[PDB]
Amino acid sequence: QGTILLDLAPEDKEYQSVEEEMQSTIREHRDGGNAGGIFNRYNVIRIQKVVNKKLRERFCHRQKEVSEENHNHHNERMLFHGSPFINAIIHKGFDERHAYIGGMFGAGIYFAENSSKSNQYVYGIGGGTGCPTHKDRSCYICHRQMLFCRVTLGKSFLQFSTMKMAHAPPGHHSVIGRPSAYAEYVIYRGEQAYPEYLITYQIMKPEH
Ligand SMILES: COc1ccc(Cl)cc1NCC(=O)N[C@H]1CC[C@H](n2c(=O)[nH]c3ccccc32)CC1
Numbered sequence: 502q503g504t505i506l507l508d509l510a511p512e513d514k515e516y517q518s519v520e521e522e523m524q525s526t527i528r529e530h531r532d533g534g535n536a537g538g539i540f541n542r543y544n545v546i547r548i549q550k551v552v553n554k555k556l557r558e559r560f561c562h563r564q565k566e567v568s569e570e571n572h573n574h575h576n577e578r579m580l581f582h583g584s585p586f587i588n589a590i591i592h593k594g595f596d597e598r599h600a601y602i603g604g605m606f607g608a609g610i611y612f613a614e615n616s617s618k619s620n621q622y623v624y625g626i627g628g629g630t631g632c633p634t635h636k637d638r639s640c641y642i643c644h645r646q647m648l649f650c651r652v653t654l655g656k657s658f659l660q661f662s663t664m665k666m667a668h669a670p671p672g673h674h675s676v677i678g679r680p681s682a683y684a685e686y687v688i689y690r691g692e693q694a695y696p697e698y699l700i701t702y703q704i705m706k707p708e709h
């Protein structure tokens with residue numbers, strides 16, 4: 502009924518395909534390391550596959566609808582997502598009703614193709630006050646989690662200066678803003694994203 506969390510063996514080509522994609526999409530943010538911490542590699546502690554029947558079905562029904570609307574192209578893309586509700590999301594799925602009106606591009610769910618970008622969001626906007634135990638945004642101790650999800654983009658609307666919209670523009674199914682820089686993929690329907698992989702990891706202090 503609920504969600505089954507499956508561990509992936511590090512020697513499974515599937516584990517390797519996800520960690521490789523997480524480690525390789527690390528980038529410099531002209532941050533100084535403030536939001537997500539100072540690092541240039543993660544210690545991937547665990548990769549779990551999130552299996553939930555109802556979520557898959559809601560997600561596949563919507564993906565069909567979007568195909569119909571976009572010349573049989575649902576445009577599925579694997580994307581990272583970071584935020585403080587990861588546990589809630591893996592059990593009940595993505596939910597736009599918990600989406601923040603004020604967001605740069607509206608009340609949607611945000612995704613990035615760069616792992617170092619979603620890591621900045623693990624403990625809230627800008628990385629809030631860091632980890633709960635150490636009030637440190639660059640904690641090398643506490644374990645963090647992020648999601649690598651299948652995101653049904655359908656036809657993406659390229660917006661390029663803020664517009665706080667509540668739904669994708671007419672005829673589109675997603676929004677891509679290029680903030681200052683990097684890209685933000687936004688959806689306004691929980692069922693357009695499926696949280697495929699749950700990743701437990703730590704940022705690692707720079708070597709010396
Ligand atoms: C709500 O506004 C935010 C608060 C903190 C961060 Cl770090 C990012 C955002 N907006 C971007 C974004 O993508 N936020 C998502 C985060 C998960 C949220 N979420 C969900 O999809 N299912 C949920 C179930 C319970 C609580 C939150 C949930 C919806 C909005």
Ligand SMILES: [Zn+2]
Nearest residue numbers: 632635640643
């Ligand atoms: Zn900590």
